[PDB]
DNA sequence: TCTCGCTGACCTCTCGAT
RNA sequence: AUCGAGAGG
DNA sequence: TCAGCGAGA
């Protein structure tokens, strides 16, 4: 009843009576799924850095007809891997490269077309990366950010 | 910038973390250590295992220029009472952990668990002298809360003593005549005779003569080999009947108490050491072990479960019969499941007790089984009956998410497996058990309020010379005498000469301490009730005296001048709640009157109506039922509910339908006012009952012998039923309801209110199995009754009705009567412990306790002055307290030059 | 979006009006609370940084410019970086990971907290939030909660629990159609499962899947009641669905009360890994999953044949089907070796494979801490005797045989990191050179020419590791006191612009040369295969190899971003082995715990008829007082398992044909009333059977799933097969006297754990030292070398005793009386001890604070 | 008489960030 | 020092 | 939070 080579070396005697129909899932699947939703590219602005950008990216003067935009974003390769991040005592993070765009329209001429569009790629801070074990390396110390149990948004009636 | 609000100047004075409670009441000290504690069975009571690593540092200035000449103080973290700090003589040991004596574990609540204790070094010569004379573990034989010994064999020692002294049928070596205990030991060691063999031994015993001399008595007694061997460590002066029985925890406790009463201090500590050694040795030799087969599952449970399930199914008759309301259904389900639980517990206990059938010399006799679980149970070492029935019977009912109980039962024990549903149900009880020690301990930590309300009292004089006292009566509420008259009167002076049944003959003259011999003499008489000198009716001003107090429970004899009785009383009252809330998780989160003897039906304070049938139905709300036998009135007290109808059954009612513990103790100590009570004010004898057009029916009560009447307003809605209740006593019940302690005081008296408070507190304490002496509650009540309002002062300096210290009013009245003036009349006021502590003369104590900003504002605007006469003030200003050793210095300070 | 969905669902759907209409016409329920993980919180912090950047952009662009406005100057990355750095490092939910063992890490990563920003408060929380709810079933473990103020608020995820798209916890259930259970699985949330009636896992089923019993126990609407087959809609997927990962590791959990199960689940997390990981003889079968998913064990990414084996590294030759077209075909697994932990324990990886052994995907190649052949091994199997022994196991205490200490079964390695930081100072008072003023010749020779200590040197208390002098008083880093160990690693950190001393250059370049040699060897190992293939673009491969080597060298030589004001940081790692002694906390998996009180000689321990003594002696009185019968059942089952292992070992000692071993092991695996496991040895080869028997010679491991474990009859049968009494109790003889104990004593093997509560870490003793500034009182910590707090309750105790002088000296002479302390120390040292207590400085502080409030408080003389 | 602020709710250890 | 997060009793 | 407390309305 042992197929893996590791288990074939020493098979544990199982006294269980109930057949197993669903195998135990990955124990750290919650952290991996959460950070993968946060990091991975989202075609829609529903989850992650994409949804975060669609919130306050259009910063502009009031009725100035010149707004700041962007096209996409990309996460670079980390300078150091986990082991030497722990050794050096530095955060294991990946630089964030975002391509922003700016549009210029005619002054007091909304009917006229946009005068010019300026797009350029800009570095925006360091985003810490989570290792394969679901943990974070911050300042050379290995850290875990636990999930939070908070009341679901909405309306409830209680006394 | 930080999220938390900035701490202002007042925040550094008030609160738990303020200057007072964090730096003046409690300081960090030098010469202190800490480590884990391990068990040393080789230690004596005055000894503990102190690692050399600590001793090199703690005694470093002493080393520069010692372990035996200088004791040390061991201290556990809670320190619920005084015995949480004790003095030991240290013996240097290798390693890091501290070796603690097994006997002081109960006093410290210590346990070899990962638990830790602190070490303190008395530096000055006086500190060492007081450590040796007061805080030594050898001087701490008796508990301060009650005269019971605090060091007691437990666990392994109890099991060893219970194994030695138990007997077996047809054991090896039965029936042989022995020349003494030494021969019994020789046959045991040689393997010729068993330890449980019923033999006949020649025992020489000593009993104290009239002059106190020891005279020997030699006789052949039917005993066992184990009891004979055990007799060798029993000191001279005790009867052989102490060991001639299967010794449980209670038996060993009683034996130690008897040894202390007869012989004294040093014989008691030597006897305790010998008992511990013998118990450890013979528990090791016994080879007692726990196994899965030791738990026997009776076949009666498999039928009791079905009976209870059918009972509840019938009780909930498909919700179509009616009366399936949530209040009635839940109560009846709980009652049925509790009945099933106790039935199964009894069945399993009965199966375990006589599980052993032993073949005698040609006879198949039956005896008490030697089952391991049972031997751990009745010995009383560790393991309650609830835990045992959880193991081998059922788990029963569990704690609800709310304060209530689960409707569904676990219907399974722990030897058999539990379903996941049943385990999920029991998780609720687990959460409740851990939450009680996590959060409810704050409610107990009541203790601080009791400490501060009473910390000022110190025994100041030998005796008042007064004659007032309080009635002492047994408690027979539960069908048996829970508190005999000996327990109430022991170690307390007598205010009035106790007279023998009849007249002109007095068994006990007044002003004599009722010790064990006097209590035995009183028990020789068939009936006795003694008026005992109390502390609430104490004529001493600014303190209490020894005679009105009684005997020092820890030291046995009469209390000395200088003892801080208030702190001891507060600790004794506050410990049991704290200790019992912690031990809640140990459990695991789990209609008629019948008399002992038949006879004619008697009643007291009963009003009843004739039913349609011949049966009598009670109408009064408060009715007591007591039976009389063919010889005398039977000694029980029972309560007959409103709707009740009347080994003989003499009462019947339905508890479900009428046709808290520490919260209750706090309510009693805070002098809470119930809404309902309405009782007569002044003894008159005539109630006018005049017709009044007002909605609230008005009652005018006019004296037979007095001209001035009294008028009261009695709302009809608030008090539906009103009685006559005339001139029996000022305070007679006019309307049904829980009596208010303030009204009870004002109308009946200080003694009556003290009796009410003491009884109501002790009922709650006794329901949980706690035993505390009544003098502590009397001290607390005395602290409650300290303020008086001077109505119609007359020649006194008091202005109109203002709250004033009762001692000041009494002193002023005495001075005026010396000069001939009339003096000031007053009425005693009942104040809760919080309010009474906040109303003290000293503002430093009040500021340290609570309400720091308000107390400081009052003292500042009023320009108050603190004389620093109490314990807390001298602790804060870092001087000698006016108690114990510093009492003489403080008296010298008061007398000045 | 989840909020809008909840708002629509609650009102069965101007928005403010509809709320009032239903108001005129349980919060702890799961449907009202959702899970917020690290990703969503990081997104929220990014939103905060981004709105700050947007405000800055609006402020900068309000001026307006023609062709002078670009994306660069408008935005700034400083606020976003600051916000994310604050979140990762200072947030309440960003916690220092528990790294005692793999189970602790798993529990921490699966932890759920009700506290945190936008959440509850522990002191404000009541009993309703802290109690178990009918919706906790399968989503949150009811057993595992903290024992302190955080009870009920801090919770652990169940084994099978997930989160849906909206963030609500859900559980898997087996769909029941037409009275037969169907293998398809539907995940249901609390509000979704409330409608349905769910059968129990403990429901007997036939071969076709129909329920055996006519009436099947179920639950509905938060209550459990008996149901017929027709109404059943869903069934539990497993018996472990409710317990968490930590609670599912306890064998025979249904025989314990939930209190002791909680205690065991918590104490499994403080278990310290030992020298050798020892598998649990009695287990559940979740050890492999925990060990694999913890990530402490090297797991073969691709299946292949092992090519190189070493303590430090393992090389796998990937199979032909698993190699990428551009891949050379070599997988290298470097192993962690003696690295410090968060809790100062040791992390070690040891290979569990041999050269040439075939390996498939997912196989364990190295064993992390507390892991034995891919199985979690938190402790050591110990032979326990439940019997009192002269009071040395009196009150929950534990007595340990000296053979346990001799065999180093519970010896643990603890690594301590010490750092020496040199800071910039004007006029150059601080020195870092090896030569220091007033330094002993032996101490100077202990350190290298660079001023740092040699790797591998034994250091005791009061020895300098790194040499430093500052004005010049010696600022050299030294071990504080007492702590002793060996220098296993030294790390030197210098910035890119920080000046490097030649001796410091020597040490740093030695370390960098070692790292570069390791990197070059690792690169050449993979390049050898490509070079051999080319022999059968050599210049291009050589150029690529040189470029990779240069990049690795540049990365190694890249200066570290040191904090401003400091030049160099030298870190010294000390490793020491802690041996068990009286005072060390020991515990099992069933809530039982204790402290070793005596190390008993081997001959004094109780021994069997065969002369084999027991290792651990436990008081039997602790078993029935508590409700942990699971420990007794595990003891019996471990005795049976060790009996089977002893029979196998006996057949191995005298040469026996493989047929007999195969027959016995097949009989042992086939034993049981009805077990799903069917181990067939006929499939195995002779060498495989011999290796299995070699692994089983120390005891056959047993798996007992929670709420599905072995029955008593099966344990008795296993005891029978091993030629052991079925009662589980054997006749023991006293070692000191040779006299048989009068009653049979249960003896078996229980899995004992060593907790991170060593007595040497806890033993402390202070005579005198530093005092606080605001109040002249001793400090308040062992690290600060402070005294013990003499709280108010202890003052009450001394008042009750009447110990006036002891209380006075503790209040004044031992604290807050500066003149009193100064005179008392001289009096004690001189031998003639007299004290004159004075006013505590804290009272003067109180007086000054009250006077600063505007209230005049004074000391009236008379 | 009833809202309405104001008051109240042991010891020890580890870690990092300010 | 303070705060946050844990842990032991 | 959850009580209990007196003092304004
Ligand atoms: N003030 C205060 N607040 C608290 O929250 N806790 C305290 N004290 N303790 C102290 O520690 C004893 C119980 O701990 P434990 O683990 O030994 O439990 P236990 O039942 O006695 O024995 P066991 O663990 O073997 O089952 C208890 O009295 C007390 O002094 C524990 C918690
Ligand atoms: Mg303990
Ligand atoms: Zn008196």
Numbering used by the authors:
A (entry chain I): 1 to 159
B (entry chain J): 319 to 383, 415 to 794, 796 to 940, 948 to 1003, 1014 to 1026, 1136 to 1373
C (entry chain I): 399 to 411, 423 to 434, 444 to 889, 913 to 977, 1017 to 1342
From the paper:
We implement these strategies using a biological sample of bacterial RNA Polymerase (RNAP) that contains in its active site an unnatural base pair (UBP) that matches 6-amino-3-(1′-β-D-2′-deoxy ribofuranosyl)−5-nitro-(1H)-pyridin-2-one in the template with 2-amino-8-(β − D-2′-ribofuranosyl)-imidazo-[1,2a]−1,3,5-triazin-(8H)−4-one as the incoming triphosphate. Both are part of an expanded DNA “alphabet“23. The polymerase adopts exclusively a single orientation on cryo-EM grids, making it difficult for cryo-EM to study pair recognition in this enzyme, and to allow those studies to guide synthetic biology. Reconstructions with and without the stage tilted as high as 60° are virtually indistinguishable. These strategies allowed the reconstruction to 3 Å resolution of a bacterial RNA polymerase with preferred orientation, containing an unnatural nucleotide for studying novel base pair recognition.
We applied our methods to the structure determination of RNAP, which contains a bound unnatural base. In the reconstruction, we could clearly resolve important features of the RNAP elongation complex, such as base stacking of upstream RNA:DNA hybrid, and the side chains of the bridge helix. The model derived from the map revealed that unnatural substrate can bind to the same nucleotide addition site as natural substrate. We show that high-angle stage tilts, combined with our processing workflows, can overcome issues with resolution anisotropy, leading to a molecular model that faithfully recapitulates the atomic details of the sample and describes how the UBP is bound. In the absence of stage tilt, the orientations for RNAP are distributed within a cone of ~20–25°, with a small number of sprinkled projections. We found that collecting data with the stage tilt angle set to 60° led to a nearly, but still incompletely sampled reconstruction, characterized by an SCF of 0.78. The fact that the SCF was just shy of the suggested baseline of 0.81 means that the primary projection distribution is <30° and there are few true positive orientations outside of the primary projection distribution. Our initial predicted optimal stage tilt angle was 51°, which should have led to an orientation distribution characterized by an SCF of 0.81. In practice, we found that a slightly higher stage tilt angle was necessary to yield a (nearly) fully sampled map. Importantly, the features of the map from data collected at 60° stage tilt were of high-quality, allowing us to derive an accurate atomic model and highlight distinct aspects of RNAP biology.
